[PDB]
């Protein structure tokens, strides 16, 4: 069940006794706990609500703190909801960590992107630059062409423009598992994932596989 | 040259519709002399929160 939460905590090597060194990414799972199981009379689906981690008492406001009080004292980082599959669930004393992937080979990861501002067009939308030697008078970079012909008099919605980049979702959907540790909450994955060390992320089983 | 029809009082007045921010943060007062200042700024008497600041 559920989409499991963690953090990118670094990069390492696992080696082989054939000779290859094999660089891999390290993820630490913070685990998820149940706060309610929902009835089929709501929306037409059986569903579950889950929370994560603990946070210091000098943060979180009363509208969120009272919803952590109805199940414990750990609190913080908000709430998630998911639909149930192949089994009926209970709330009392129940939690989930890396044992969720004990028979899973590929995973699906969702995180956030780095801030880049208004970001422009050359890197953002691959608007290829032009000559700085021979011709091209004050046209070193030109942002494509916003109109397909000079008769219509319109710019169309089927085109890209410069604008705020970062703080949005990013994903990798075919990511291979290497190792898990049910005592240390380790998830060890093939290659690299979006964002630097300390990036907060959620993980699911891979479905395009 | 660069525009069609001399721009209207409504169109030019739109800039006035964003004005709601209160001036000078409504100041702070010194609780030991009654003079006003900005919320972390120093008095004309060389004092801040009832003690001496800066060489004068």
């Amino acid at each position: 069940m559920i989409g499991l939460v963690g953090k990118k905590v670094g990069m390492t090597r696992i080696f082989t006794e054939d000779g290859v060194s094999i660089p891999v990414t390290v993820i630490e799972v913070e685990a998820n706990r149940v706060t309610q199981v929902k009835d089929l009379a709501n929306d037409g689906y059986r569903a579950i609500q889950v929370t994560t981690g603990a946070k210091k008492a000098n943060r979180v406001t009363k509208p969120e703190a009272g919803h952590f009080a109805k199940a414990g004292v750990e609190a913080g980082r908000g709430l998630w909801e998911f639909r149930l599959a192949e089994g009926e669930e209970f709330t009392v004393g129940q939690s989930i960590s890396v044992e969720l992937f004990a028979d899973v080979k590929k995973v699906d990861v969702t995180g956030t992107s780095k801030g880049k501002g208004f970001a422009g067009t050359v890197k953002r939308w691959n608007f290829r630059t032009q000559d700085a030697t021979h011709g091209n008078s004050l046209s070193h970079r030109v942002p494509g062409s916003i109109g397909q012909n000079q008769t219509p008099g319109k710019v169309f919605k089927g085109k890209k423009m410069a604008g705020q980049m970062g703080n949005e979702r990013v994903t990798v959907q075919s990511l291979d598992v290497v190792r898990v540790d049910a005592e240390r909450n380790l998830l060890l994955v093939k290659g690299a994932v979006p964002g630097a060390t300390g990036s907060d992320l959620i993980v699911k089983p891979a479905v395009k596989a | 040259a660069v525009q069609q029809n001399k721009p209207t009082r409504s169109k030019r007045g739109m800039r006035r519709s964003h004005d709601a921010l209160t001036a000078v943060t409504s100041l702070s007062v010194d609780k030991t002399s009654g003079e006003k200042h900005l919320r972390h700024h120093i008095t004309a008497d060389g004092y801040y929160r009832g003690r001496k600041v800066i060489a004068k």
Partner: protein
């Protein structure tokens, strides 16, 4: 499109920055107190404190390190005869930025930067 920085860029070139900060750090140990622009006084707080952490030294390889990189003609000995020793048991925190308002009629953030202890 800057990705990270640890020390303000500043207006005017690197050959002005160096010449101005060595002179103004000299002026700060020569007068104990300066009034100047806040972001520039924070950049002064970066350079005056490692000089006070040097001013507690006595080794032949430290006592006259880079004399012409931060040079004076009045307090050259007073720096090591009193001023470095005045903070040599303290571990950091040798100054106060003293953030105030106005340099002219308009509010640019001003700093009345001072030593954490003064002679008179």
């Amino acid at each position: 499109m800057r990705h990270r920085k640890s020390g303000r860029q500043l207006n005017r070139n690197s050959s002005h920055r160096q010449a101005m900060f060595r002179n103004m750090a000299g002026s700060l140990v020569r007068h104990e107190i300066i009034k100047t622009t806040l972001p520039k006084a924070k950049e002064l707080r970066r350079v005056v404190e490692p000089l006070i952490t040097l001013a507690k030294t006595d080794s032949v390889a430290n006592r006259r390190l880079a004399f012409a990189r931060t040079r004076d003609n009045e307090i050259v000995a007073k720096l090591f005869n009193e001023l470095g020793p005045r903070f040599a048991s303290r571990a950091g925190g040798y100054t106060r930025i003293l953030k105030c308002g106005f340099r002219a009629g308009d509010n640019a953030p001003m700093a009345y930067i001072e030593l954490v202890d003064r002679s008179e």
